[PDB]
């Protein structure tokens, strides 16, 4: 298991391509019927930043939960005493790209709980192994992970 390099993404294709996470289906807003498809992840082994104080970071698709929960296990196995951390889940802040998978609960930005940047390349490798459809070492401060839409699986 080798860490991802800075700015590396796996698989080595664009996020929205068929081999990776696939196309953006459309923004999910709070006042929408599709908002009801999102449920909060309440995993005790995951830290949610929730700087918004809204619980938005917990909201994600079922497939996102499944891969994130597997990742929570491997993180603790890799570094005893450390946990998976989520800085961004579903987003309504507009704090991502124009057509971000965050806007429909298909992406998370993650760190370790100790916010040790030196662990993030390996964290990214763990996210690949946990089954995320696309993983990108997007900034010095976080790893972006995403999944296929529910109706693509």
């Amino acid at each position: 298991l080798t860490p991802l390099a800075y700015k590396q993404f796996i698989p080595n294709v664009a996020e929205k391509t068929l081999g990776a996470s696939g196309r953006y289906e459309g923004k999910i807003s709070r006042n929408s019927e599709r908002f009801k498809e999102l449920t909060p992840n309440y995993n005790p082994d995951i830290i949610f930043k929730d700087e918004e104080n809204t619980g938005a970071d917990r909201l994600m698709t079922q497939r996102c939960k499944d891969k994130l929960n597997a990742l929570a296990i491997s993180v603790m196995n890799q570094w005893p005493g450390v946990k998976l951390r989520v800085t961004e889940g579903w987003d309504e802040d507009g704090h991502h790209s124009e057509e971000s998978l965050h806007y429909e609960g298909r992406a998370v930005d993650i760190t370790t709980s100790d916010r040790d940047r030196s662990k993030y390349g390996m964290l990214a490798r763990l996210a690949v192994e946990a089954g995320f459809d696309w993983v990108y070492y997007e900034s010095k401060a976080h790893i972006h992970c995403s999944v296929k839409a529910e109706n693509s699986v």
């Epitope: 800085t87 790209s97 100790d114 010095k140 401060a141 976080h142």
Partner: antibody, heavy 119, light 108 residues
């Protein structure tokens, strides 16, 4: 409402040190990194360093390693920048600025502190 | 350290005209490029990050593009309130470094 409030302008004699402060409000202070940036007019913006209140970790620009010391007081939500052995080169505006855990770039800035080095 | 060379140093523009500012890195900075706006007597304000993402609240008239070494900041139709010094900044390499600024002045 996120705010970084800096201490007022300073007149300091050459060779002496100056300590300037930056108080954060409207967010959980311990939770975000705080950076210091110098602005003159001839070298406009220069990154001095960063302190991470949550870990106590500091990283300095090598250009400022001998000059600057960054500290925090978590109980009062205040970061401090101490610049030692001041010369004319040190007269400038100094900002504190917060990152938002997306990389080393800054969403909220303090109002700046003007330091004038003079006898 | 990575040097960011920003051009032009100054622009004089009528409200409604296009503004194009260029930032060139001495070596690749991937997409780790930020643009700030600094209005007279104010602290810098974040406008664009990751080379092309508009920050929240930032008007549609402001865009960024580029990847690697060549970056462009555009105001499509400049407004009277956009008078400011604009700066690029990279954070790919350590330390983070800024361009020298472009002063946008308004003709009327």
């Amino acid at each position: 409402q996120v705010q970084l409030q800096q201490s007022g302008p300073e007149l300091v004699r050459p060779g002496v040190s100056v300590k300037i402060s930056c108080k954060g409000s409207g967010y959980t202070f311990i939770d975000e990194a705080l950076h210091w940036v110098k602005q003159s007019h001839a070298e406009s913006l220069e990154w001095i360093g960063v302190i991470r209140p949550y870990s106590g970790e500091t990283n300095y620009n090598q250009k400022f390693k001998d000059k600057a010391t960054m500290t925090v007081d978590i109980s009062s939500s205040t970061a401090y920048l101490e610049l030692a052995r001041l010369t004319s080169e040190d007269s400038a505006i100094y900002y504190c600025a917060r990152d938002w855990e997306r990389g080393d770039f800054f969403d909220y800035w303090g109002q700046g502190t003007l330091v004038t080095v003079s006898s | 350290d990575i040097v960011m060379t920003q051009t032009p140093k100054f622009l004089l523009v009528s409200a409604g005209d296009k503004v194009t500012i260029t930032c060139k890195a001495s070596q690749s900075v991937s997409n780790d490029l930020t643009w700030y706006q600094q209005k007279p007597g104010q602290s810098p304000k974040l406008l664009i990050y990751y080379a092309s993402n508009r920050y929240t609240g930032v008007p549609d008239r402001f865009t960024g593009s580029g990847y690697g070494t060549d970056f462009t900041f555009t105001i499509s139709t400049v407004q009277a309130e956009d008078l400011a010094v604009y700066f690029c900044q990279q954070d790919y390499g350590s330390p983070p470094t800024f361009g020298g600024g472009t002063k946008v002045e308004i003709k009327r």
